[PDB]
Design a protein around this ligand. Sequence first.
Ligand SMILES: [Zn+2]
Length: 455
Amino acid sequence: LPASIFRAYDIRGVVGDTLTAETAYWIGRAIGSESLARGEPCVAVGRDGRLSGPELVKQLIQGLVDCGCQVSDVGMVPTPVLYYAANVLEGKSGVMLTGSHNPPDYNGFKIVVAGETLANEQIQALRERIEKNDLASGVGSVEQVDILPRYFKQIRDDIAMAKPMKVVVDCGNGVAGVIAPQLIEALGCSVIPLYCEVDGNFPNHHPDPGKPENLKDLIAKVKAENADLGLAFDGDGDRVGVVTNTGTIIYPDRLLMLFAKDVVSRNPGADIIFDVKCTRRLIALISGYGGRPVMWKTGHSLIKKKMKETGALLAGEMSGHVFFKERWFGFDDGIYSAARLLEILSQDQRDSEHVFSAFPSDISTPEINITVTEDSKFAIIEALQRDAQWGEGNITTLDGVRVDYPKGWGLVRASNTTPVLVLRFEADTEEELERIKTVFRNQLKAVDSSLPVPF
Ligand SMILES: [Zn+2]
């Protein structure tokens, strides 16, 4: 049975509750059926370092084999490593059992089928195969594969560190510690490990570098050891956080600026994708270097579809997923992105603080949240889209309502997993900021005079 675990970009839930082995079995069955339906019997399977996993894989794999698929099992590995398998093995399908950065009892499935990362209706399709028992049946197969070494090798062969660097690597007790300290070490660095022991209990901070609180120990170690950079991976390793030698947290939009400058120098006119939460500075910077800027929707999986659709050589989103296609395969991977970042910084005699500090900075507000209600969440964005008036602002309604003015912008959208409206604003001078926070405040009040707007 049921459902709130068939989300938009994956399947997630509590390991001994909404998601039990049983549920995992009928999901592997769905996945196996669809892959077959796309002409793909070969599927890979990889898992993260969760407690609930060791078994689960099992119910998942039993589900694939009871379809007739040839399962290539890669055991415990980083998410991008699973994605790597689905790109290099024979089958272009792959399934990673994972709960990302969620708490220890959460787990789930990120699914790739015949090359495509399933989303939205593609995932529901899966569920609705169980609700009618429309799955396939067959005499599957299971083979053990060890891909990590070839993954490890591929990057090492690709990267060229120029000077040496001392780096603090924090894994959060998630699955990155199986190759991240090592590879970065192998890459040509000295590594101060922080929580790089796979432990699904998460004795320390959870592996979510998206929240600053989880970079406090990281930020202190960098300073205390006079390291050149600090890195933090999420639980399953498709996300990376960055801090400079002085402890400044680099946000992904700023990270992309460094990456776009690099990618575009070797690929004139390259398409570069970022989301509606990324600084407009990114737009001008990409253009200035000769590239084609492409603002798209938020959602690792959506960014990914857009990339194949546009031929983009690089993508990123504010949640930290960085997607390299130049020299790579086009999927998100915090490990490879780290590598790529070390590559660039190693070739600059300045320290990491100045490299990033040199980029233009506007006046930005932090992310603002407004608890509304589940019932009203989407309808508020719709009312704005229908009736808000924004002057000569350029309106992007790809994902909520983003309005770009010449000297600043603002965003309002609905969270897909909380009854909350999420906002952001940025502008060069403070007088233009408040004039933008004012146009939004007013349009919101025009929707509902009783809505609480804290700005
Ligand atoms: Zn992740």
